[PDB]
């Protein structure tokens, strides 16, 4: 009584696939034929930020686009500045293998975690002037991939136990548990309306989850390899991600089909950093070839290379208003573009 | 006005930069390892050398994604605990050696058990009889050299796998522990010193 269930599941999957094929009677390529290309774009480093010691895997931009936080393997959490070069705060991290960091929308809270099963949360506003430790969460059975802040009191963390989480400061443990993934979650992003968020796994699958309902609604199986980075459009009705097979696919929430393909034969390096722009016209994607590439969202043509990084680019940061683009890498150098 | 910025932040930046130098000089002295194979961190000092062990067992046995973080470590300690099972260890060693991120990290090999405790080989290997022992140092007891043939064969296989893709970038240091059950850290320190010396030679293009 197991083969019949698998056969029924395969038949249902084939039916959904042919329904998607019949529904997708037109492609986006024939619609964007009349759009003038953006042309070549020149990128330069306004300033170079230095002072770190080890590799940087994730960084979060500020709400006001003035202060940014970066996590390094040396155990130090350094908050940098965008208008100037001088640093502001240096938070000594207890964990020596941190892989992610988060910045609160109000700016009063920061988060960190990775390879320690503990998501330490610190506060930046205090009377003494020195940062303290708010609380430590020990309800995970896997390495933390990335942490995000829904609100000033809500935090969502993805761990290595192939399950998501929803922690609360006052409650102390997870309010609800998300189950159904078949692979380890590597990254997640939040839509501007803070209602819909996706989480990519190693099974080439992207799932849509509800913070209130707690049940999955959308499942995408249009990829071929594991997903490393993911981000949302500023509109929030669509999102794109880059897998290890050197290609990007722009998924749609309303349309259950792949819209655009950004595969290039000249490059085979994987993609570990995916972010959008203010208007979403430019799709900045990281690469392992010691450079970053910019792809148009309507013509799938390269319009600028952010070369100049000593090591592999691991994290990418774009401000909410699209004022500047910050690129990180395994070296202890930080560059701000424009 | 707005002169408070370059009257407060100017020294606020550099009052923590002095502590950053101390953090750099204490982090550079420490040596980072990785106990992969067979409670979370161990700190010890041997011959005024800061050693910062990294042994992890909390997560699942899926090191496909999180093994890329161990790139700045000096060396990786490998435990075989042979005392099937050896095939998985060989596959893990091949994946570590062929990894592009781990190609610059040397691996320290321990060809014995790790619990410090005081025999079918021909069935799991098609060629066992057509093997000759190396001209290395004989064991001090010198009793029953037949059992040493299997460990010599697996050491030779590990050396061949290491030298298949070990062209100068990283090297292998096989060892046979549990003979004295006391000198288990001195060999690791010597291997780390040799790795650092070879890396310094590579920076000077003298090797």
């Amino acid at each position: 009584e197991l083969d019949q269930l698998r056969q029924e599941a395969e038949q249902l999957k084939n039916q959904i696939r042919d329904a998607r094929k019949a529904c997708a009677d037109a492609t986006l390529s024939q619609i964007t034929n009349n759009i003038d290309p953006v042309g070549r774009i020149q990128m330069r480093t306004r300033r170079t930020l230095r002072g770190h010691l080890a590799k940087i895997y994730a960084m979060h931009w500020g709400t006001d686009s003035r202060l940014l936080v970066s996590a390094s393997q040396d155990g130090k959490l350094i908050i940098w500045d965008s208008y100037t070069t001088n640093k502001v705060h240096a938070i000594p991290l207890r964990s020596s293998w941190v892989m992610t960091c988060a910045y609160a929308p109000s700016g009063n809270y920061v988060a960190c975690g990775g390879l320690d099963n503990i998501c330490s949360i610190y506060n930046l506003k205090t009377r003494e002037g020195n940062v303290r430790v708010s609380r430590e969460l020990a309800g995970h059975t896997g390495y933390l991939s990335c942490c995000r802040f829904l609100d000033d009191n809500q935090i969502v963390t993805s761990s290595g136990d192939t399950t998501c989480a929803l922690w609360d400061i006052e409650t102390g443990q997870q309010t609800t548990t998300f189950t159904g993934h078949t692979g380890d979650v590597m990254s997640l992003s939040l839509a501007p309306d803070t209602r819909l968020f996706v989480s990519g796994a190693c099974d080439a699958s992207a799932k849509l989850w509800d913070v209130r309902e707690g049940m999955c609604r959308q499942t995408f199986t249009g990829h071929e390899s594991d997903i490393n980075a993911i981000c949302f459009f500023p509109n929030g009705n669509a999102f794109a991600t880059g897998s290890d097979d050197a290609t990007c696919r722009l998924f749609d929430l309303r349309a259950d089909q792949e819209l655009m393909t950004y595969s290039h034969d000249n490059i085979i390096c994987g993609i570990t950093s995916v972010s959008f722009s203010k208007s979403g016209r430019l799709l900045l994607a990281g690469y392992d070839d010691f450079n970053c590439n910019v792809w148009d969202a309507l013509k799938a043509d390269r319009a600028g290379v952010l070369a100049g990084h000593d090591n592999r680019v691991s994290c990418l940061g774009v401000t909410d208003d699209g004022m500047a683009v910050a690129t990180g890498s395994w070296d202890s150098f930080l560059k701000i573009w424009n | 006005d707005q002169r408070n910025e370059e009257k407060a932040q100017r020294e606020a930046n550099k009052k923590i930069e002095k502590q950053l130098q101390k953090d750099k000089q204490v982090y550079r002295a420490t040596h980072r390892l990785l106990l992969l194979g067979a409670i979370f961190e161990t700190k010890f000092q041997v011959d005024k050398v800061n050693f910062h062990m990294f042994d992890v067992g909390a997560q699942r046995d899926e090191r496909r994604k999180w093994i890329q973080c161990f790139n700045d470590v000096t060396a990786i300690i490998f435990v075989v605990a042979s005392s099937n099972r050896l095939q998985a260890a060989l596959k893990l060693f091949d994946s570590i050696w062929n990894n592009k991120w781990l190609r610059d990290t040397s691996v320290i090999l321990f060809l014995n058990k790790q619990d410090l405790l005081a025999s079918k080989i021909e069935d799991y290997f098609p060629e066992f009889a057509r093997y000759t022992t190396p001209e290395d140092a004989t064991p001090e007891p010198g009793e029953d050299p037949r059992v040493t043939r299997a460990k010599y064969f697996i050491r030779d296989e590990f050396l061949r796998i290491s030298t298949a893709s070990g062209d100068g970038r990283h090297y292998c240091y096989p060892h046979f522990t549990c003979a004295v059950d006391t000198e288990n850290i001195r060999r690791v320190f010597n291997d780390c010193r040799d790795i650092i010396q070879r890396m310094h030679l590579r920076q000077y293009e003298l090797l």
Partner: nanobody
Framework: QVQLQESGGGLVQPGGSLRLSCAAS????????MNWVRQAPGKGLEWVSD????????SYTGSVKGRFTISRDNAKNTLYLQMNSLKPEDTAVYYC?????????????????????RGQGTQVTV
């Protein structure tokens, strides 16, 4: 998505030299390495053999060396495993494993945990 379906199992007499093949769909066959993983009943998963993209890096374990032959073709997008010299203790279930790293051999298929790129498995017995 990735599809890995295989057929040709069942119970056969020893020495029959029957052919077992697995079909790969949904991904490029040449760009991704293919591995063979078997799981004995009551024992953990064991790696069988692997074939590189070019077809020169072919290796076998200590129990299936010489007797096992693997062939790769690009037109049919299928992988073949020639199993011979049947023995009663060789019974297991075989998965047409797939390495998810293109142009690089840094992947794990020997672990006992489930994999995101492994087949359902078919029972093989003498």
């Amino acid at each position: 998505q990735v599809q890995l379906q295989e057929s040709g199992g069942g119970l056969v007499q020893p020495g029959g030299s029957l052919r077992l093949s697995c079909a790969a769909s949904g991904f490029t066959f040449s760009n991704y390495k293919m591995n063979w993983v078997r799981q004995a009943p009551g024992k953990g998963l064991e790696w069988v053999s692997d074939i590189s993209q070019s077809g020169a890096s072919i290796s076998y374990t200590g129990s299936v060396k010489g007797r096992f032959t693997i062939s790769r073709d690009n037109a049919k997008n299928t992988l073949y495993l020639q199993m011979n010299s049947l023995k009663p203790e060789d019974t297991a279930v075989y998965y047409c494993a797939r390495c998810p790293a293109p142009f690089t051999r840094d992947c794990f298929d020997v672990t006992s945990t489930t994999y995101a790129y492994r087949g359902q498995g078919t029972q093989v017995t003498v």
